[PDB]
Amino acid sequence: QNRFKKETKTCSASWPRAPQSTLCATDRLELTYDVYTSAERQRRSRTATRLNLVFLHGSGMSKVVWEYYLPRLVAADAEGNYAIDKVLLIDQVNHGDSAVRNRGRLGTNFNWIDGARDVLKIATCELGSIDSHPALNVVIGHSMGGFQALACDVLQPNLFHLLILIEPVVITRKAIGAGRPGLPPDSPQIPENLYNSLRLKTCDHFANESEYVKYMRNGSFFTNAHSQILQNIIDFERTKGPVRTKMEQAQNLLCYMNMQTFAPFLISNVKFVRKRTIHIVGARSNWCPPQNQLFLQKTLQNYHLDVIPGGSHLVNVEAPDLVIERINHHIHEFVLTSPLQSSHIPQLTLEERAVMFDRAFDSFKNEALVK
Amino acid sequence: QNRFKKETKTCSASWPRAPQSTLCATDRLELTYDVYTSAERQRRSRTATRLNLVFLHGSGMSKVVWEYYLPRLVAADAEGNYAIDKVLLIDQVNHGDSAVRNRGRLGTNFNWIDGARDVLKIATCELGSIDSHPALNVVIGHSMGGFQALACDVLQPNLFHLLILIEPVVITRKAIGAGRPGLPPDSPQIPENLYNSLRLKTCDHFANESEYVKYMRNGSFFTNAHSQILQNIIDFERTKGPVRTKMEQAQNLLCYMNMQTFAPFLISNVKFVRKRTIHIVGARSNWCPPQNQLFLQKTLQNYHLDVIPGGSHLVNVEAPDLVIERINHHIHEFVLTSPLQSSHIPQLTLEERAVMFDRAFDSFKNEALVK
């Protein structure tokens, strides 16, 4: 990929966090993310909208699943006068390179809302320079990342203009079974059959390189991923003669075991998400129950569904070309209808600012005053 | 005051912000706050809880209204083994010293939730060192600051352990009148009679020093404040022969004109605030309608009301001794019943961390798995 300069950066994770996010209360987690910056900035006119994209991986994956997307994303468009300026590919604290940095620090409580706070900490930093203006920011999330896209807007509704959710996980199936007695209403839970079956597809450690690649291509969740994305997954996860993955099996499993302790907060707040939100689903997906999709449709005021024919829950890695075509379509249409868009850095004195404010205030007072 | 080392610090405000928070989209606001640090740290045992307090002023006031409180706050208690470590006194972007820093940058939209984000940015920074542990953090807010205390917990529920709300403003009276046609549901509004009367008590500029002090002592909102707090207000606000206050009249008025654009979000989320919350009201206060108080009582799971006999809406500045006695009482009782409280900085190797995690995970799996 030769379109964007790549830099890997590391910073501290958001703090504070849910109890038992770390092993010890004095531990502090870090985040590692890759920033991709356009090398096309000398082709931008003054009036050109900068598009910034932030991609949030699914449970048990990493930022690497989006690398295939980078050269295939929305070309700079002449008259619509926009271009991609930055793309951020983020690993949650217990995934990918962030997990490696956080070895020995992670606890049992991974709260996806804490992870949305991490996203905000990164993106508000990276997208916040007076340079990034006039900007339009887009968050694209798969699975957990889709939940987190929504939670980002809830917690900071002035950052993302467009949400693209690919198979978001919001409403899960409630376990029926028996089942620990005396628990508070919203206690962490997972059905045994789901745990066992996830355990068999989340292996972490292997005798050698041959057994590692054999498992990745035959026994992991990624066997049907686009061959280039699978190869990228294989190469990114490998750590070292036995082989261990960056993704820890326990951390992978914990992504499934704690939903009740944070999903109600998100569910209760989807009604505040006023942004255009694209919901991309795989037609063959039964990963989430019907109520998951229908809740989003009923609750998001500005909502569009795209169904990927043949797609599974992992449609982002198994049919990336179809997913990319949608993401490009929606970003293009969104920019075309987006309000202008002032791009001059104001050269105003304090006195000019005073006259302008007083005028703004008079206008606002006239609109607010109930006579 | 000789109890605490004082330092005034300035940082950037939270970003992004509601539209028209600033005059221009490229402006960036700052925050100024005072940090008070205990000089008693050599008297702390290893097991001593550090108490950190964060005080949030009301609309049209500033951080100065809490200075009188500093020497009168909860004494270090022997056997309850706690002491105040840090106290933060914060000026919102359009108040006090923050307003001075932000001269010419402020727009018409002051969204109190943005202001809660500012509080979090400051407090998470100041209270986040591995030093502050074992800590208990308390947020104390008057009026707007009370709203903001609640919003802090909503947006970051792992920071404050105890909320003390003094005359919080959450549910306001809806203006009946006529009244701008064609407006969205939740448009900013203020009744004309309220605006006019607030305008007469929010004067900003004065011919000279004599007219300034005459107005502060006879025509401002603070005429009945405790004489020391009034003197502190007078001295803190004075800027300079004509006199202008740090508090801008337009900014003061804007605190009252925009509630509909952010209060529903807070209202909808009070149900998530699980912390012990003390609600201190003035018995003679009619500033907020009945529904304001009753909503909080019905909605906060862990709630305690204290009624200050004779108190008005400005009970924090008019009867500070009564308010302080309550704040001390509640902090003391809260600490006494608060769970221990491990105070060693863990000296664990990666391998020890591995054994400990694996044990934690096994325990958690057994509690979560529905068999």
PDB file of C-alpha atoms in Angstrom, chain A residues 110-239:
ATOM      1  CA  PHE A 110     -13.526  -5.778  29.334  1.00  0.00           C
ATOM      2  CA  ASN A 111     -16.310  -3.188  29.149  1.00  0.00           C
ATOM      3  CA  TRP A 112     -16.923  -2.177  25.503  1.00  0.00           C
ATOM      4  CA  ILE A 113     -17.936   1.363  26.620  1.00  0.00           C
ATOM      5  CA  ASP A 114     -14.421   1.795  28.173  1.00  0.00           C
ATOM      6  CA  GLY A 115     -13.152   0.696  24.749  1.00  0.00           C
ATOM      7  CA  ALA A 116     -15.304   3.471  23.143  1.00  0.00           C
ATOM      8  CA  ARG A 117     -13.741   5.927  25.512  1.00  0.00           C
ATOM      9  CA  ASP A 118     -10.320   4.712  24.199  1.00  0.00           C
ATOM     10  CA  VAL A 119     -11.474   5.334  20.641  1.00  0.00           C
ATOM     11  CA  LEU A 120     -12.535   8.841  21.545  1.00  0.00           C
ATOM     12  CA  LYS A 121      -9.256   9.584  23.341  1.00  0.00           C
ATOM     13  CA  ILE A 122      -7.325   8.554  20.144  1.00  0.00           C
ATOM     14  CA  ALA A 123      -9.595  10.166  17.567  1.00  0.00           C
ATOM     15  CA  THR A 124     -10.136  13.419  19.349  1.00  0.00           C
ATOM     16  CA  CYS A 125      -6.380  13.761  19.557  1.00  0.00           C
ATOM     17  CA  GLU A 126      -5.604  12.731  16.013  1.00  0.00           C
ATOM     18  CA  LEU A 127      -8.493  14.647  14.336  1.00  0.00           C
ATOM     19  CA  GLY A 128      -8.422  17.691  16.508  1.00  0.00           C
ATOM     20  CA  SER A 129      -5.761  19.949  14.894  1.00  0.00           C
ATOM     21  CA  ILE A 130      -6.775  23.230  13.304  1.00  0.00           C
ATOM     22  CA  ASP A 131      -5.208  21.581  10.252  1.00  0.00           C
ATOM     23  CA  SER A 132      -7.901  18.762   9.873  1.00  0.00           C
ATOM     24  CA  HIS A 133     -10.545  21.578   9.018  1.00  0.00           C
ATOM     25  CA  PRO A 134     -12.953  21.443   7.086  1.00  0.00           C
ATOM     26  CA  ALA A 135     -13.332  17.821   8.019  1.00  0.00           C
ATOM     27  CA  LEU A 136     -15.914  15.102   7.882  1.00  0.00           C
ATOM     28  CA  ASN A 137     -15.308  12.152  10.095  1.00  0.00           C
ATOM     29  CA  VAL A 138     -16.635   8.670   9.558  1.00  0.00           C
ATOM     30  CA  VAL A 139     -16.527   5.711  11.995  1.00  0.00           C
ATOM     31  CA  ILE A 140     -16.764   2.247  10.605  1.00  0.00           C
ATOM     32  CA  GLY A 141     -17.142  -0.645  13.042  1.00  0.00           C
ATOM     33  CA  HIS A 142     -17.641  -4.392  12.799  1.00  0.00           C
ATOM     34  CA  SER A 143     -19.363  -6.500  15.670  1.00  0.00           C
ATOM     35  CA  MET A 144     -18.004  -5.058  18.923  1.00  0.00           C
ATOM     36  CA  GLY A 145     -16.661  -2.139  16.858  1.00  0.00           C
ATOM     37  CA  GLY A 146     -20.181  -1.369  15.666  1.00  0.00           C
ATOM     38  CA  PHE A 147     -21.436  -1.247  19.236  1.00  0.00           C
ATOM     39  CA  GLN A 148     -18.446   1.059  19.945  1.00  0.00           C
ATOM     40  CA  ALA A 149     -19.195   3.348  17.004  1.00  0.00           C
ATOM     41  CA  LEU A 150     -22.648   3.985  18.472  1.00  0.00           C
ATOM     42  CA  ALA A 151     -21.235   4.462  21.961  1.00  0.00           C
ATOM     43  CA  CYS A 152     -18.717   6.961  20.625  1.00  0.00           C
ATOM     44  CA  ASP A 153     -21.510   9.146  19.352  1.00  0.00           C
ATOM     45  CA  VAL A 154     -23.413   8.797  22.597  1.00  0.00           C
ATOM     46  CA  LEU A 155     -20.493   9.897  24.680  1.00  0.00           C
ATOM     47  CA  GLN A 156     -19.236  12.614  22.226  1.00  0.00           C
ATOM     48  CA  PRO A 157     -21.844  13.472  19.642  1.00  0.00           C
ATOM     49  CA  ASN A 158     -19.799  16.223  17.943  1.00  0.00           C
ATOM     50  CA  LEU A 159     -17.097  14.041  16.408  1.00  0.00           C
ATOM     51  CA  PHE A 160     -18.436  11.570  13.802  1.00  0.00           C
ATOM     52  CA  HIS A 161     -20.738  12.792  11.050  1.00  0.00           C
ATOM     53  CA  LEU A 162     -21.440   9.344   9.511  1.00  0.00           C
ATOM     54  CA  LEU A 163     -21.577   5.889  11.228  1.00  0.00           C
ATOM     55  CA  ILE A 164     -21.171   2.706   9.251  1.00  0.00           C
ATOM     56  CA  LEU A 165     -21.973  -0.379  11.300  1.00  0.00           C
ATOM     57  CA  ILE A 166     -21.126  -3.758   9.820  1.00  0.00           C
ATOM     58  CA  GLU A 167     -22.923  -6.515  11.712  1.00  0.00           C
ATOM     59  CA  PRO A 168     -23.016  -4.578  14.949  1.00  0.00           C
ATOM     60  CA  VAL A 169     -23.583  -6.595  18.163  1.00  0.00           C
ATOM     61  CA  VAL A 170     -26.035  -4.766  20.467  1.00  0.00           C
ATOM     62  CA  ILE A 171     -28.838  -7.079  21.574  1.00  0.00           C
ATOM     63  CA  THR A 172     -27.656 -10.587  22.381  1.00  0.00           C
ATOM     64  CA  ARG A 173     -29.637 -13.788  23.020  1.00  0.00           C
ATOM     65  CA  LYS A 174     -30.358 -14.298  26.756  1.00  0.00           C
ATOM     66  CA  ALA A 175     -29.022 -17.572  28.120  1.00  0.00           C
ATOM     67  CA  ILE A 176     -31.720 -20.002  29.343  1.00  0.00           C
ATOM     68  CA  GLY A 177     -30.164 -22.618  31.736  1.00  0.00           C
ATOM     69  CA  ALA A 178     -29.229 -23.340  35.395  1.00  0.00           C
ATOM     70  CA  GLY A 179     -27.298 -21.069  36.061  1.00  0.00           C
ATOM     71  CA  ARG A 180     -25.799 -19.269  39.108  1.00  0.00           C
ATOM     72  CA  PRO A 181     -28.262 -18.422  42.066  1.00  0.00           C
ATOM     73  CA  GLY A 182     -28.551 -14.997  43.845  1.00  0.00           C
ATOM     74  CA  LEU A 183     -27.085 -12.755  41.082  1.00  0.00           C
ATOM     75  CA  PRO A 184     -27.926  -9.025  40.494  1.00  0.00           C
ATOM     76  CA  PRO A 185     -30.269  -8.348  37.443  1.00  0.00           C
ATOM     77  CA  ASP A 186     -27.458  -7.581  34.869  1.00  0.00           C
ATOM     78  CA  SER A 187     -24.667  -9.966  35.878  1.00  0.00           C
ATOM     79  CA  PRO A 188     -22.171 -11.262  33.380  1.00  0.00           C
ATOM     80  CA  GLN A 189     -23.354 -14.530  31.740  1.00  0.00           C
ATOM     81  CA  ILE A 190     -22.659 -16.783  28.836  1.00  0.00           C
ATOM     82  CA  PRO A 191     -24.374 -20.080  27.855  1.00  0.00           C
ATOM     83  CA  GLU A 192     -22.076 -23.086  28.260  1.00  0.00           C
ATOM     84  CA  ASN A 193     -22.652 -24.402  24.711  1.00  0.00           C
ATOM     85  CA  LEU A 194     -21.612 -20.997  23.269  1.00  0.00           C
ATOM     86  CA  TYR A 195     -18.472 -20.857  25.515  1.00  0.00           C
ATOM     87  CA  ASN A 196     -17.335 -24.379  24.565  1.00  0.00           C
ATOM     88  CA  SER A 197     -17.756 -23.783  20.863  1.00  0.00           C
ATOM     89  CA  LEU A 198     -16.012 -20.430  20.987  1.00  0.00           C
ATOM     90  CA  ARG A 199     -13.198 -22.069  22.946  1.00  0.00           C
ATOM     91  CA  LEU A 200     -12.555 -24.530  20.113  1.00  0.00           C
ATOM     92  CA  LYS A 201     -12.220 -21.680  17.542  1.00  0.00           C
ATOM     93  CA  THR A 202     -10.087 -19.250  19.608  1.00  0.00           C
ATOM     94  CA  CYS A 203      -6.882 -21.255  20.100  1.00  0.00           C
ATOM     95  CA  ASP A 204      -3.901 -19.171  21.154  1.00  0.00           C
ATOM     96  CA  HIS A 205      -0.837 -21.417  21.287  1.00  0.00           C
ATOM     97  CA  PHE A 206       0.610 -24.025  18.970  1.00  0.00           C
ATOM     98  CA  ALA A 207       3.483 -26.513  19.009  1.00  0.00           C
ATOM     99  CA  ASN A 208       5.100 -25.008  15.920  1.00  0.00           C
ATOM    100  CA  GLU A 209       4.634 -22.937  12.777  1.00  0.00           C
ATOM    101  CA  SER A 210       3.072 -25.778  10.735  1.00  0.00           C
ATOM    102  CA  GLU A 211       0.329 -26.427  13.350  1.00  0.00           C
ATOM    103  CA  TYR A 212      -0.265 -22.658  13.699  1.00  0.00           C
ATOM    104  CA  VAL A 213      -0.910 -22.057   9.995  1.00  0.00           C
ATOM    105  CA  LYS A 214      -2.977 -25.324   9.811  1.00  0.00           C
ATOM    106  CA  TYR A 215      -5.235 -24.153  12.619  1.00  0.00           C
ATOM    107  CA  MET A 216      -5.525 -20.578  11.220  1.00  0.00           C
ATOM    108  CA  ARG A 217      -6.587 -21.918   7.767  1.00  0.00           C
ATOM    109  CA  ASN A 218      -8.815 -24.809   9.056  1.00  0.00           C
ATOM    110  CA  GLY A 219      -9.991 -24.302  12.641  1.00  0.00           C
ATOM    111  CA  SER A 220     -10.110 -20.584  13.375  1.00  0.00           C
ATOM    112  CA  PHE A 221     -13.018 -18.181  12.756  1.00  0.00           C
ATOM    113  CA  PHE A 222     -11.132 -16.859   9.679  1.00  0.00           C
ATOM    114  CA  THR A 223     -11.018 -19.944   7.394  1.00  0.00           C
ATOM    115  CA  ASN A 224     -13.316 -18.333   4.866  1.00  0.00           C
ATOM    116  CA  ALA A 225     -11.797 -14.843   4.967  1.00  0.00           C
ATOM    117  CA  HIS A 226     -10.576 -13.336   1.682  1.00  0.00           C
ATOM    118  CA  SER A 227      -7.207 -15.027   1.059  1.00  0.00           C
ATOM    119  CA  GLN A 228      -5.266 -11.698   1.398  1.00  0.00           C
ATOM    120  CA  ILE A 229      -6.980 -10.816   4.682  1.00  0.00           C
ATOM    121  CA  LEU A 230      -6.390 -14.301   6.057  1.00  0.00           C
ATOM    122  CA  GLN A 231      -2.704 -14.042   5.099  1.00  0.00           C
ATOM    123  CA  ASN A 232      -2.573 -10.580   6.799  1.00  0.00           C
ATOM    124  CA  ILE A 233      -4.251 -12.072   9.912  1.00  0.00           C
ATOM    125  CA  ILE A 234      -1.802 -14.978   9.940  1.00  0.00           C
ATOM    126  CA  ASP A 235       1.244 -12.748   9.644  1.00  0.00           C
ATOM    127  CA  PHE A 236       0.009 -10.092  12.134  1.00  0.00           C
ATOM    128  CA  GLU A 237      -0.976 -12.545  14.900  1.00  0.00           C
ATOM    129  CA  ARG A 238       2.198 -14.632  14.802  1.00  0.00           C
ATOM    130  CA  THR A 239       4.470 -14.211  17.869  1.00  0.00           C
TER     131      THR A 239
END
